Design a protein around this nucleic acid. Structure first.
Ligand SMILES: [Mg+2]
Ligand SMILES: [Mg+2]
Length: 758
DNA sequence: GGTACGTGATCG
DNA sequence: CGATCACG
């Protein structure tokens, strides 16, 4: 007796928390309320007698004192050992951060546990509730906005000039200037356009609102303009406004009762691109071109009133492709949510490490296993500093016909068979153990470890799904089950990396090294078997390898490689599996996770080399693209070296246009809060002194001028740069922009920074 | 309702 | 050098 859980949160009523579970039941929105769930933490005491002193600990919050409501002695498992801890109950979840350190402080408290779990996620776990279960069909709406922007303006100065939305009914634009198009709704003002978006969202009542970077652009901007205009945005199903949440240094927006699905973090994790522009992303997924209308063109069309039909078509397409992309990427996010038992909102905005931790926390509750704590700043830094033990340095030069092989589906099987877990590492009075090669870590065989045990169930569940897929005549369940087995593969293949994740609860350096040591025996086997087949291995890392058959035909390399994977998988026991990732026409390798390739369709794929960001000048970005194109598209490293020598000489002779020398960097604080004054801050302070309203979010465009001292004293605001009066710093653009951009790439061919000038 | 991550440039 | 700051 349940529908599909889409989210969960809590509200406070008479100072007491009420859990809200948002559900979709046979097409209808339902909200369930729970007033009975209580927040709690665990305390490990030196002796049971101490509970009388410990239960009397107090804190303060909201003018009122905070108390431990009730105490309960519980028997749990910690570090693969029985443990007795006290469950300390509180009235409100905001009581936990107020009292937890007062409890930890106590002389009779050995340690505290499970004290930083958000209340609604604590509820989902403890109540055994899993989001996104069932065949419930959700509704979707893509939303986008276009704003009037001028160089280096304060966030929200310019009005919103268009709002676009799309669904299965089509893509529409709301604007407040006359545009004669079938999909354009013309209203009287920015205020009436924002009120129309509110009306469209309330009427369509979508379960999912899809945006492209709506967390940082569309919704913060809508909220800023709504504030300036004195209007509300009752977008929540409870009529609440979209809520900005601070995630890192960037934002995350939640719309209560709905799933705000921002594609930007999703696409950034899923696919590898030098830029994540909507146009680049759409082309990568659907193989279709999308036209861009730049901010300066939008401003010119709006202010002049000429060429506005072009701007409205761009706004309409932004919503249309946002809808198509959302429908493409949501199914996998929905199955990952269900698998880890947390809402899509949170899961779509998480790293795989955090997905593993949410899976582990729920599994720990189900297995009565006390969860280890997250490290403190000291421990987190020490983990970042730790050195692991075990591949080779890449082959130099430009290689043709490159085959890509993936090793990742090897590691879950190694964790399971060798019982690699923090609870099985170096156990006292162990009867039988596995010793890791080289590294020598001992893993107890006496009981299955917490992680190996879960992994085995994950892998068995995936095999059952795959078996149901072969035996199914229904194409609808085959589709759903395919996303489910893919979600398990993604989660299982994230465990190896998680053991080494410095913020992990079940962090285990020895576990990660041991998996690396056992894994290496299979990587050495793959390498040897490839090499006896005539293959040259050009690059090897724990993730995979790149190989070619020097001087062979491309179809021969493919055929032999495909035959090779088929053969190795037949020799490797169990679920240990090698995967043929792909083929590349050309490629070069600099170091670990620093390489560049080109496929047979002419698409360039790189890792850890490209500088397509606003804080790098166009001259450096343009030169680097030209160097990569000379190498990968022309197969000519001599051309790439000549490109760099020409650009640097042209910079020396002041032959490069100043527009290609601009650096852009955002102001993120009040100017007095800066500890180190970088060039953009030095420029910003001068603007503020002139009367400019400098605020966090303002992007500073500057050019570095010739002179003595650090660059900060020699940087000028772009609007103040006069080509007649000012002279840019050619040495800075050569040595700090152009050469660093290309020196890593060209190192793969034997050139040093010094070889790239006349 | 806890506030990302890895990585590289520049300051102090 | 270590610290500080920004990108996407
Ligand atoms: Mg747009
Ligand atoms: Mg939430």
């Amino acid at each position: 007796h349940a529908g599909m859980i889409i989210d969960a949160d809590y509200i406070t009523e008479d100072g007491k928390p009420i859990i809200r579970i948002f559900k979709k039941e046979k097409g209808e929105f339902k909200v369930e309320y729970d007033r009975t769930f209580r927040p709690y933490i665990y305390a490990l005491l030196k002796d049971d007698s101490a509970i009388d002193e410990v239960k009397k600990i107090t804190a303060e919050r909201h003018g009122k004192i905070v108390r431990i409501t009730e105490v309960e002695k519980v028997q749990k498992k910690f570090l693969g050992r029985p443990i007795e801890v006290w469950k300390l109950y509180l009235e409100h979840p905001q009581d936990v951060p107020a009292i937890r350190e007062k409890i930890r402080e106590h002389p009779a408290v050995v340690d505290i546990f499970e004290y930083d779990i958000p209340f609604a996620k604590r509820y989902l776990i403890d109540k055994g509730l899993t989001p996104m279960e069932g065949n419930e069909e959700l509704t979707f709406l893509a939303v986008d906005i276009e704003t009037l922007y001028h160089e280096g303006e304060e966030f929200g100065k310019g009005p919103i000039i268009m709002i676009s939305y799309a669904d299965e009914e089509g893509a529409k634009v709301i604007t407040w200037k006359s545009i004669d198009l079938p999909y354009v709704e013309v209203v009287s003002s920015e205020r009436e356009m924002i009120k129309r978006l509110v009306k469209v969202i309330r009427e369509k009542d979508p379960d999912v609102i899809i945006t492209y970077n709506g967390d940082n652009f569309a919704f913060p901007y809508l909220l800023k303009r709504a504030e300036k205009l004195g209007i509300k945005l009752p977008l929540g199903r409870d009529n609440s406004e979209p809520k900005m949440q601070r995630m890192g240094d960037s934002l995350a927006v939640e719309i209560k009762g709905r799933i705000h699905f921002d594609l930007f973090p999703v696409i950034r994790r899923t696919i590898n691109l030098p830029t994540y522009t909507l146009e680049a992303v759409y082309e990568a997924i659907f193989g279709k071109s999308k036209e861009k209308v730049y901010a300066h063109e939008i401003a010119e069309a709006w202010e002049t009133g000429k060429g506005l039909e072009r701007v409205a078509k761009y706004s309409m397409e932004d919503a249309k492709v946002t809808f198509e992309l959302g429908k493409e990427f949501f199914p996998m996010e929905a199955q990952l949510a269900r698998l880890v038992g947390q809402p899509v909102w949170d899961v779509s905005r998480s790293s795989t490490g955090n997905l593993v931790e949410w899976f582990l926390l729920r599994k720990a509750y189900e297995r009565n296993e006390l969860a280890p704590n997250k490290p403190d700043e000291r421990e987190y830094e020490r983990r970042l500093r730790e050195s692991y033990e075990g591949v080779k340095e890449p082959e130099k030069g430009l290689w043709e016909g490159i085959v890509s092989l993936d090793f990742r589906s090897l590691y879950p099987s190694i964790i399971i068979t060798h019982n690699v877990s923090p609870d099985t590492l170096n156990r006292e009075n162990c009867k039988e153990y596995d010793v890791a090669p080289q590294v020598g870590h001992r893993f107890c065989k006496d009981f299955p470890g917490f992680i190996p045990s879960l992994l085995g169930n994950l892998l068995e569940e995936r095999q059952k799904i795959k078996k149901r897929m072969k035996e199914s005549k229904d194409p609808v369940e085959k589709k759903l089950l395919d996303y489910r087995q893919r979600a398990i593969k993604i989660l299982a293949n994230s465990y190896y990396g998680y053991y080494g994740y410095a913020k992990a609860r079940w962090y285990c350096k020895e576990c990660a090294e041991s998996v690396t040591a056992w894994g290496r025996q299979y990587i050495d086997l793959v390498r040897r078997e490839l090499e006896s087949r005539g293959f040259k291995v050009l690059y090897i890392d724990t993730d995979g390898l790149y190989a070619t058959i020097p001087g062979a035909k491309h179809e021969e390399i493919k055929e032999k490689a495909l035959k090779f994977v088929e053969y190795i998988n037949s020799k490797l026991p169990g679920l240990l599996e090698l995967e043929y990732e792909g083929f590349y026409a050309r490629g070069f390798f600099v170091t670990k996770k620093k390489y560049a390739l080109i496929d047979e369709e002419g698409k360039i794929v790189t890792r850890g080399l490209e500088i397509v960001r606003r804080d790098w000048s166009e001259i450096a970005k343009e030169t680097q693209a030209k160097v990569l194109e000379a190498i990968l598209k022309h197969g000519n490293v001599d051309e790439a070296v000549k490109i760099v020598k020409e650009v640097t000489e042209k910079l020396s002779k002041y032959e490069i246009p100043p527009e290609k020398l601009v650096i852009y960097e955002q102001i993120t604080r009040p100017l007095s809060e800066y500890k180190a004054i970088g060039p953009h801050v030095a420029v910003a302070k001068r603007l503020a002194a002139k009367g400019v309203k400098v605020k966090p979010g303002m992007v500073i465009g500057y050019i570095v001028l010739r002179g003595d001292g650090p660059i900060s004293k020699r940087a000028i605001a772009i609007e103040e740069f006069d080509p007649k009066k000012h002279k840019y710093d050619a040495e800075y653009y050569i040595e700090n922009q152009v050469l660093p951009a290309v020196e890593r790439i060209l190192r793969a061919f034997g050139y040093r920074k010094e070889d790239l000038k006349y």
